[PDB]
Ligand binder design. Sequence first.
Ligand SMILES: CCN(CC)S(=O)(=O)c1ccc(OC)c(NC(=O)c2[nH]c(C)c3c2CCCCC3=O)c1
Ligand SMILES: [Ca+2]
Length: 127
Amino acid sequence: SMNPPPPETSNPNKPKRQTNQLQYLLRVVLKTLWKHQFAWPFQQPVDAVKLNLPDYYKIIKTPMDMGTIKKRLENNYYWNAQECIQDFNTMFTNCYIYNKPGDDIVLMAEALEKLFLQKINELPTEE
Ligand SMILES: CCN(CC)S(=O)(=O)c1ccc(OC)c(NC(=O)c2[nH]c(C)c3c2CCCCC3=O)c1
Ligand SMILES: [Ca+2]
């Protein structure tokens, strides 16, 4: 089976804005996780074809990854910070749905999620 198309990262019909919270999410939150030693399984959509995981997209119907989130921020796809935070949470939830305690990928996701929650707990004041 094929991979699904990756999540949209631009929508020509959606209004666009820059905010301090969106700057923080891209330049502080995403950057911190992107550079982390455990970022690499989360920097792009799960390629279930190259990895031969034909049940991945039978189980995961809302895929999300930091490469998509990065592009969404870079393309001003998000209007509200909460849209972006939701995507990070979907990414982690998917990992815990598909995988089991003790899996390496779960240890990696838990570490990244701890760092994510630390950085979003310092999200700047809304305008
Ligand atoms: C395709 C080649 N590369 C990718 C550019 S790769 O970086 O060489 C590479 C190599 C092996 C790999 O896994 C064994 C992964 N896997 C992953 O990225 C990955 N990410 C997640 C979130 C998951 C997985 C698969 C394990 C369980 C399902 C899951 O939850 C990558
Ligand atoms: Ca699980």
